[PDB]
Design a protein around this ligand. Structure first.
Ligand SMILES: [Mg+2]
Ligand SMILES: [Mg+2]
Ligand SMILES: [Mg+2]
Ligand SMILES: [Mg+2]
Ligand SMILES: [Mg+2]
Ligand SMILES: [Mg+2]
Ligand SMILES: [Mg+2]
Ligand SMILES: [Mg+2]
Length: 50
RNA sequence: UACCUGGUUGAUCCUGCCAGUAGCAUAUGCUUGUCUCAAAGAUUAAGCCAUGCAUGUCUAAGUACGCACGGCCGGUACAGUG
């Protein structure tokens, strides 16, 4: 299942402003950036060993 | 600038101090037109204090669902300032 689908959003409607919906930033979410950081951490060990 | 002068005797030569002389640094008195520097509650009380200020800090890079502001899609995690 996808977590990004099930985020609880907050409606937000102030007088004189258009209606809006806000959702929080997901934390501890596996993203390509996390995998690439781990990949480079692994790749530095190879350089040290060589 | 390696310097002296008055005072003891009726007069003299001494010893010897007192007083005189010139800096310096604290106070005080009188006086004071222009410019450049410039010390300044140490001495008596490391005595006592009204009031105000004298220590705070964010980058692309720890944590933003404050519309507090803000552009588009509109479930389509999180635009940005903060
Ligand atoms: Mg995280
Ligand atoms: Mg005489
Ligand atoms: Mg003298
Ligand atoms: Mg003039
Ligand atoms: Mg004092
Ligand atoms: Mg004192
Ligand atoms: Mg002082
Ligand atoms: Mg101070």
């Amino acid at each position: 299942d996808d977590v990004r689908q099930y985020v609880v959003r907050k409606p937000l409607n102030k007088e004189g402003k258009k209606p809006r919906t806000k959702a929080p930033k997901i934390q501890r979410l596996v993203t390509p950036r996390v995998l690439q950081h781990k990949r480079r951490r692994i790749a530095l060990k190879k350089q040290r060993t060589k």
